[PDB]
Ligand binder design. Structure first.
Ligand code: CLA
Ligand code: CLA
Ligand code: CLA
Ligand code: CLA
Ligand code: CLA
Ligand code: CLA
Ligand SMILES: CCCCCCCCCCCCCCCCCC(=O)OC[C@H](CO[C@@H]1O[C@H](CO)[C@H](O)[C@H](O)[C@H]1O)OC(=O)CCCCCCCCCCCCCCCCC
Ligand SMILES: CC1=C(C#C/C(C)=C/C=C/C(C)=C/C=C/C=C(C)/C=C/C=C(\C)C#CC2=C(C)C[C@@H](O)CC2(C)C)C(C)(C)C[C@H](O)C1
Ligand SMILES: CC1=C(C#C/C(C)=C/C=C/C(C)=C/C=C/C=C(C)/C=C/C=C(\C)C#CC2=C(C)C[C@@H](O)CC2(C)C)C(C)(C)C[C@H](O)C1
Ligand SMILES: CC1=C(C#C/C(C)=C/C=C/C(C)=C/C=C/C=C(C)/C=C/C=C(C)/C=C/C2=C(C)CCCC2(C)C)C(C)(C)C[C@H](O)C1
Ligand SMILES: CC1=C(C#C/C(C)=C/C=C/C(C)=C/C=C/C=C(C)/C=C/C=C(C)\C=C\C2=C(C)CCCC2(C)C)C(C)(C)C[C@H](O)C1
Ligand code: SF4
Ligand code: SF4
Lengths: 174, 151, 162, 219, 80, 34, 104, 139
């Protein structure tokens, strides 16, 4: 019973191969401190937010919406946060995501009791997971690009704290 | 619901089962401390306690001792800790002489040999932990001040 | 009490023998060491401003310990810390300063042990008695002649060291 | 039960003849200092970690003398071994003032790996794991032909080369601390102290204070 | 333990025996007083030395006399 | 002062080691059953 | 320390009584139930036109800009921090009482 | 006669006033009594307990604590059915009170008088008379 990702460590007790994105990676034993299902919901929430965050970084490089250049002159990545707190955009997104989090909080209590799977909000309008085999690989891919986007979001925002360039402007201007 | 109950089902023993006394969090911390952790020899219990205690001892002597404003402050603080450690080891030794009858049992703390094991571990660990703190403070300017190097 | 190998026992005899052999080495070593001036700033008087009132001596000139004396004492402090750690946490094989309480005492040697020229206990005890006698002899010789111990050791050895 | 390396001495009780790189050499009975079941496994892992770090350091010192990577010379200049550790650290946030994090990046990633091995050693000490000392499962190219632990001969090689490299990198560090020459200049300059390179005091200058006053200080 | 004595002036009023908090005293048969009974001290190892018996005694000088002596766990009234 | 080194030797020993040893050995004597 | 969820771990508040601390639900609800009313603005020099949470959240960042330097005695950070946590601790206490005990 | 260890104990919620390590390593005292009711009494070591209808059993550290409870149980609940035991860590149970089935304040045959001095208290010997002599001061 050895960890797959860390061959010299014992398999983490609270972790199981049924979980999506499982590789046996918990060398610190944090899956025992907090409940594993709370951790799964927290990780999936972090995954989806950082996926939007990374795509938002990239897209805001590629283009901006009509009239956005009027409001934001030179602010690029996190400067646009500072100027759009003045304007109403950030407050609007905060209000509506907090609206959604209220029902997300009900759903977290629901998944704590055991009625709901973590990160499961039954949001499949286009029937992507209907086959039942795609659904598993989609869960795995969601966690994979979710983890990668957490690392990427950090790695761009810190690249921008250094240079000010932003992701595509960092690449094109080496 | 009631959070306070008699201690280990016994209403007439001189103790209570309170959340500080018997919560899962408390039980965890107590059971995993070097004094109570399973699978530890008394010598190893002494080493882990000694390393912990010796390490923190250096700091108050260094920062607040008589030679604190000198450049020999860390040397004086270490030797002050070393003197306290030696005095404490004498206290440990005399406790063992007067508190435990001589029996073959050595894997328990409250035995004559097991106390002598624990005392041996504590002295080595205390000097080791104080020496480690000496090395860290000597080299790192953040530790020499209170973090005041940044301001 | 005294049934742990302390007092006038062969355990104490052996232990004091070992310390006096080391002490004869250390006395010879310091005689040679300060004869050639290899103790740095040997006369330089330590300042209470740096070291505090433990450095004071009240000799009329300087009112402070010399640096040579402090250096010799710090050397002794090195071997005292070793001594404490070896007394309380000895090695697995090392002869212990204290004893089990029910130990069998080694048989007393007598006037002279069997001449076993090896790295033996007989050689250790003979040389230890000789070194303890030598310590006393050197002390008395220096006191009566009026000379320093360092000079007395040099003269006994034929001024080889300095 | 006498010892192989020292025939006259009695064999050290904790050592087993089944542990690689064993010739009965433990006069001080360091292997007996703790009664615990996994203390000898801790000692063996400590030996292997010391040996692997030392092999890396010895090869590193030699190859650093051979060449340096592009751009390194314009930053550090003409420092050679332990002084380059010092030079980076003078130019790094927290320890110094500059735009570099070279030794700190090494500390970051080595420390992540090391806390992982911290848990591995702790698990191996208390008998919760049937893992040998030094085995992290690292064998990407099949060299032990199905076992990452390797063969008895190749672990004996690892331990022996490790011990050699501990001695060797210790020699190289001290030879630099006094001549300042670095490995290959030192090995070339077999008459030495005759002309040595002016090299900086280390971050531990106190240690070089009995050289002149008490010791000869040929340099 | 403490030493508890009963002198032949005891009128057999049983008051010392009733006042004793540790059941040290009891009444034995006698013929030297009208009551036909005298106090006795069979269990002085349990005497804590409170001297509640002496307070209870009504003879002019106390028929029961407690003499505080060597201290024990029992006579020091230690629950630890 | 003649033999001026003596107070700096004897006062710490008399004031610290001497009580430290009599307290240590008195404690052993007063806490022994036999 | 550690947090216990609404779902059943083997955590016991005392010797033999298991008790679900609702640390996710109570902490989340107490935080939101205190922060949202506290958004109420006030044109007072301590608040500066913001609410108590927002003036406080503003004062975390301003003092974080001068990261090594601590806030001064007359700095509004300490008063804002004390008042915010006093209400937050009170709502956490009352929230734990309400949720754990009344269960609804 | 011997203590039936299985007798149920009065409902108590515990206190810090109970017995300590000296009870489990030196001696412990127990008291049993019969109650006609399920009623509240005061523990000698703390707050209030409830004695169960029928037979009760307590453990206390001091003999005086068992008798102080016995006094209260007989003065307010008129239970005279109380038996006090001494218990050693060897398992030995030593019956204590009432020692011969009859209360000490009532006379009993076969009781031998201990401590009885044939003269009055003023007839003792002066300390000087018995100095360096083993002779006792009670005559
Ligand atoms: C928070 C982001 C943000 C901000 C600050 C603005 C701000 C603005 N938009 Mg834009 N817009 C946005 C998001 C945003 N928009 C989004 C998400 C969409 C949908 C894709 C649009 C689609 C849009 C259109 C189609 C137009 C504007 C226009 C305008 C400007 C109004 C000028 C006028 O005469 O009317 C104004 C500066 C107008 C303009 O003049 O832009 C050039 C216009 O024609 N907006
Ligand atoms: C539920 C309905 C709802 C309503 C009534 C509003 C109302 C508003 N939004 Mg919000 N918004 C909503 C949902 C809603 N939003 C949702 C679901 C999101 C996604 C998180 C946003 C994200 C958002 C942003 C990012 C921005 C607004 C903005 C605006 C303002 C546009 C004013 C204007 O000139 O409109 C006429 C313009 C249109 C009708 C464009 C089409 C107004 C306060 C803008 C603003 O000024 O914030 C105050 C702004 O920048 N909204
Ligand atoms: C998806 C993950 C991802 C990716 C692709 C990148 C990619 C990049 N990062 Mg970012 N980064 C990441 C995560 C990531 N980072 C994370 C999680 C952090 C932690 C906060 C950072 C912090 C970071 C900093 C601080 C810097 C970069 C820099 C860089 C660039 C050069 C690579 C380099 O110097 O590494 C060297 C690689 C090795 C030595 C491998 C052996 C490159 C564009 C550098 C840059 O040019 O940005 C301005 C830079 O200075 N990254
Ligand atoms: C900690 C050690 C260290 C240090 C201080 C440097 C520092 C430097 N390197 Mg070197 N380098 C290192 C390790 C190091 N490198 C390693 C491990 C490798 C991998 C083999 C390289 C490979 C390398 C190459 C291939 C080149 C440099 C170059 C440079 C210089 C970059 C100038 C510039 O405009 O960047 C522009 C270049 C990059 C951002 C990346 C290339 C700079 C002084 C460049 C140079 O010499 O130009 C003057 C260059 O072409 N470095
Ligand atoms: C009752 C006698 C007595 C008393 C109270 C003192 C008091 C003192 N002497 Mg001492 N001294 C005495 C006799 C005494 N002297 C005699 C007779 C000698 C000649 C051998 C000395 C030689 C001497 C030296 C060489 C030094 C002192 C020093 C000192 C001072 C510090 C304490 C110390 O280091 O003691 C150390 C004292 C000794 C080792 C000498 C032995 C002490 C006497 C003889 C024993 C008295 C025992 C007493 C009757 C019973 C005590 C037990 C009690 C609990 C009942 C202190 C003022 C030191 C000083 O001046 O510091 C500034 C110092 O360096 N004294
Ligand atoms: C500070 C916020 C606050 C306040 C005032 C209350 C108040 C109340 N709650 Mg609520 N609750 C809160 C937060 C709060 N709760 C949160 C955050 C949660 C979610 C975790 C809940 C979940 C909850 C449930 C599930 C239930 C209640 C119920 C109740 C009522 C009686 C039980 C109780 O808690 O006694 C508190 C008693 C009082 C407040 C009145 C006593 C008066 C004194 C002066 C108390 C003052 C305390 C303090 C100083 C006020 C601080 C206010 C502010 C500055 C922080 C009472 C009206 C129960 C009820 O009645 O149902 C409607 C019920 O079933 N609460
Ligand atoms: C058995 C050893 C186990 C650990 C082994 C780890 C290292 C072993 C191999 C080392 C060989 C390579 C050398 C690498 C050296 C790295 C040096 C280093 O990084 O230093 C790391 C740190 C900091 O040291 C420096 O910090 C600088 C900024 O100030 C820089 O950021 C640098 O990163 C760092 O070098 O040193 C310590 O770890 C000190 C010990 C931990 C201190 C925690 C903060 C203090 C806590 C005090 C609060 C408690 C209460 C106080 C009471 C009131 C007081 C007024
Ligand atoms: C010399 C000396 C030291 C020493 C020492 C010791 C242990 C000296 C011991 C001397 C002893 C114990 C002498 C015993 C004499 C008894 C006789 C001659 C009677 C015979 C019939 C030490 C080790 C402190 C170092 C110091 O740098 C110099
Ligand atoms: C294990 C693993 C892998 C791997 C790997 C790697 C990278 C392995 C690296 C192995 C190395 C580098 C071993 C080096 C040992 C060095 C020694 C013994 C020399 C010591 C110096 C001496 C004696 C000297 C000296 C000197 C003196 C004192 C004075 C000086 O002036 C000069 C001088 C030099 C003369 C791979 C990836 C292949 C996969 C595989 O499936 C599993
Ligand atoms: C402050 C501020 C704001 C902002 C903002 C934002 C968007 C802040 C976002 C910050 C983020 C997401 C930081 C993430 C850092 C990721 C790290 C350190 C992971 C490292 C991985 C490691 C060490 C290695 C991992 C691993 C490797 C491969 C090796 C071992 C294995 C393993 C351990 C798995 C605004 C908006 C107000 C604007 C304002 O003007 C400024
Ligand atoms: C980076 C950095 C630094 C650094 C550093 C480093 C890496 C320092 C390394 C020091 C080392 C590894 C020294 C090696 C000592 C081994 C010895 C002395 C063996 C001795 C003797 C014998 C007889 C062995 C005998 C043996 C043989 C023959 C066979 C018989 C058995 C045995 C007895 C075992 C600094 C400190 C300079 C600071 C600077 O700012 C930055
Ligand atoms: S002193 Fe107290 S315990 Fe002793 S017999 Fe008199 S009343 Fe009883
Ligand atoms: S109280 Fe006095 S008089 Fe009464 S029975 Fe006791 S000893 Fe006798």
């Amino acid at each position: 019973a050895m960890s797959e990702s860390v061959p010299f460590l014992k398999k983490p007790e609270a972790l199981d191969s049924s979980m999506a994105g499982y590789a046996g990676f918990d060398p610190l034993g944090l899956s025992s401190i907090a409940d594993i299902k709370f951790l799964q919901e927290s990780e999936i929430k972090h995954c989806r937010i950082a996926m939007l965050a990374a795509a938002g970084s990239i897209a805001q490089d590629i283009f901006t919406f009509p009239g956005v250049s009027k409001v934001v002159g030179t602010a690029k990545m996190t400067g646009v946060h500072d100027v759009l707190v003045k304007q109403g955009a950030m407050g609007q997104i905060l209000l509506w995501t907090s609206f959604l989090e209220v029902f997300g909080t009900i759903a977290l209590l629901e998944t704590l009791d055991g009625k709901r799977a973590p990160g499961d909000f039954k949001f499949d309008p286009l029937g992507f997971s209907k086959n039942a085999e795609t659904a598993k690989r989609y869960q795995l891919s969601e966690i994979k690009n979710g983890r990668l986007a957490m690392l990427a979001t950090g790695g761009m925002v810190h690249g921008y704290f250094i240079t000010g360039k932003g992701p595509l402007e960092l690449l094109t201007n080496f | 619901s009631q959070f306070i109950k008699p201690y280990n089902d016994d209403p007439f023993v001189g103790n209570l089962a309170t959340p500080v006394s018997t919560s899962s969090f408390t039980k965890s911390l107590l059971s995993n401390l070097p004094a109570y952790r399973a699978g530890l020899s008394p010598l190893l219990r002494g080493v882990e306690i000694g390393l912990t205690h010796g390490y923190f001892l250096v700091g108050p002597f260094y920062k607040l001792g008589p030679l604190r404003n000198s450049d020999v402050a860390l040397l004086s603080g270490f030797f002050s800790a070393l003197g306290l450690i030696v005095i404490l080891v004498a206290c440990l030794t005399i406790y063992g002489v007067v508190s435990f009858e001589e029996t073959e049992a050595k894997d328990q703390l409250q035995t004559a040999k097991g106390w002598r094991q624990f005392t041996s571990g504590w002295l080595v660990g205390s000097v080791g932990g104080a020496s480690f703190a000496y090395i860290l403070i000597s080299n790192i300017p953040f530790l020499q001040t209170a973090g005041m190097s940044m301001l | 009490f005294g049934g742990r190998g302390l007092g006038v026992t062969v355990n104490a005899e052996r232990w004091n023998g070992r310390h006096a052999m080391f002490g004869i080495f250390a006395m010879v070593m310091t005689s040679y060491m300060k004869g050639h001036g290899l103790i740095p700033d040997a006369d330089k008087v330590l300042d209470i401003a740096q070291w505090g009132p433990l450095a004071a001596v009240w000799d009329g000139a300087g009112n402070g310990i010399s640096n040579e004396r402090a250096i010799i004492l710090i050397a002794h402090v090195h071997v005292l810390v070793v001594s404490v750690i070896a007394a309380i946490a000895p090695f697995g094989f090392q002869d212990t300063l204290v004893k089990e309480k029910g130990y069998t005492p080694e048989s007393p040697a007598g006037l002279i042990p069997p001449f076993k020229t090896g790295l033996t206990a007989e050689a250790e005890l003979i040389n230890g008695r000789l070194a303890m006698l030598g310590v006393i002899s050197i002390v008395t010789a220096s006191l009566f002649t009026g000379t320093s111990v360092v000079d007395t050791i040099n003269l006994g050895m034929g001024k080889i060291l300095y | 039960a006498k010892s192989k390396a020292i025939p006259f001495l009695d064999a050290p009780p904790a050592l087993s003849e089944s542990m690689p790189g064993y010739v009965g050499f433990d006069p001080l009975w360091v292997s007996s200092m703790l009664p615990d079941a996994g203390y000898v496994k801790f000692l063996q892992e400590a030996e292997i970690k010391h040996g692997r770090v030392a092999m890396l350091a010895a090869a590193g010192a030699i190859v650093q003398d051979i060449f340096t990577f592009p751009g390194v010379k314009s930053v550090i200049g003409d420092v050679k071994m332990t002084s380059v550790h010092d030079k980076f650290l003078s130019m790094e946030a927290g320890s110094g003032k500059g735009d570099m994090a070279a030794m700190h990046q090494l500390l970051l990633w080595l420390g992540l790996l090391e806390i992982a091995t911290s848990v591995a050693i702790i698990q191996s000490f208390k008998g919760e794991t049937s893992r040998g000392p030094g085995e992290f499962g690292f064998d990407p190219l099949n060299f032990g032909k199905g076992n990452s632990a390797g063969s008895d001969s190749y672990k004996l090689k690892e331990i022996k080369n490790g011990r050699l490299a501990m001695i060797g990198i210790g020699g190289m560090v001290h030879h630099y601390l006094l001549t300042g020459k670095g490995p290959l200049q030192f090995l070339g300059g077999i008459p030495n102290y005759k002309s040595c390179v002016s090299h900086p005091d280390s971050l531990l200058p106190w240690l070089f204070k009995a050289v002149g006053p008490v010791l000869p200080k040929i340099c | 333990s403490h030493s508890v004595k009963v002198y032949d002036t005891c009128i057999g009023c049983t008051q010392c025996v009733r006042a004793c908090p540790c059941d040290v005293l009891e009444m034995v048969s006698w013929d030297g007083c009208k009551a036909g009974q005298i106090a006795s001290a069979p269990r002085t190892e349990d005497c804590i030395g409170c001297k509640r018996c002496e307070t209870a005694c009504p003879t002019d000088f106390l028929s029961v006399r407690v003499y505080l002596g060597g201290e024990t766990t029992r006579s020091m009234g230690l629950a630890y | 002062m003649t033999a001026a080194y003596l107070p700096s030797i004897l006062v710490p020993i008399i004031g610290l080691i001497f009580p430290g040893l009599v307290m240590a050995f008195a404690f052993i004597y007063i806490e022994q059953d036999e | 320390l550690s947090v216990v969820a609404q779902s059943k771990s083997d955590f016991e508040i005392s010797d033999g009584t298991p008790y679900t601390l609702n640390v996710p639900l109570v902490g989340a609800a107490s935080f939101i139930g205190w922060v949202v009313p506290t958004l109420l603005p006030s044109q007072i020099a301590l608040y500066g036109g913001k609410g108590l949470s927002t003036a406080f959240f503003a004062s975390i960042g301003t003092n974080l800009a001068k990261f090594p330097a601590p806030p001064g005695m007359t700095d509004p950070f300490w008063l804002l921090c004390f008042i915010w946590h006093s209400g937050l601790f009170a709502t956490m206490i009352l929230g734990s009482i309400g949720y754990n005990g009344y269960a609804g | 006669e011997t203590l039936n260890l299985q007798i149920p104990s009065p409902t108590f919620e515990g206190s810090t006033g109970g017995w300590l390590r000296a009870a489990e390593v030196e001696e412990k005292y127990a008291i049993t009594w019969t109650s006609p009711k399920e009623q509240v009494f005061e523990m000698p070591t703390g707050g209030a307990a409830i004695m169960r209808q029928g037979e009760n059993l307590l453990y206390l550290a001091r003999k005086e604590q068992c008798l102080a409870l016995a006094t209260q149980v007989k003065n307010s609940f008129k239970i005279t059915d109380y038996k006090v035991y001494r218990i050693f860590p060897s398992g030995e149970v030593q019956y204590l009170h009432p020692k011969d089935g009859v209360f000490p304040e009532k006379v009993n045959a076969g009781r031998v008088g201990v401590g009885n001095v044939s003269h009055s208290i003023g007839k003792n010997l002066n300390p000087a008379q018995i100095k360096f002599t083993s002779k006792s001061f009670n005559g």
